[PDB]
């Protein structure tokens, strides 16, 4: 129905939001 992350516990509304999320919060801890 919805998509979620596997690194942290955040949710997204499409697999587009998620696609960016990762290099926002999981950008090599920087
Ligand atoms: Zn995450």
From Swiss-Prot:
<comment type="function">
    <text>Probable transcriptional activator. Binds to the consensus sequence 5'-AGGCCY-3'.</text>
</comment>
<comment type="similarity">
    <text>Belongs to the krueppel C2H2-type zinc-finger protein family. ZFX/ZFY subfamily.</text>
</comment>
<feature type="zinc finger region" description="C2H2-type 6">
    <location>
        <begin position="3"/>
        <end position="26"/>
    </location>
</feature>
<protein>
    <recommendedName>
        <fullName>Zinc finger Y-chromosomal protein</fullName>
    </recommendedName>
</protein>
């Amino acid at each position: 129905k919805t998509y979620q992350c596997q690194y942290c516990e955040k949710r997204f509304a499409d697999s587009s939001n998620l696609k960016t999320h990762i290099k926002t919060k999981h950008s090599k801890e920087k």
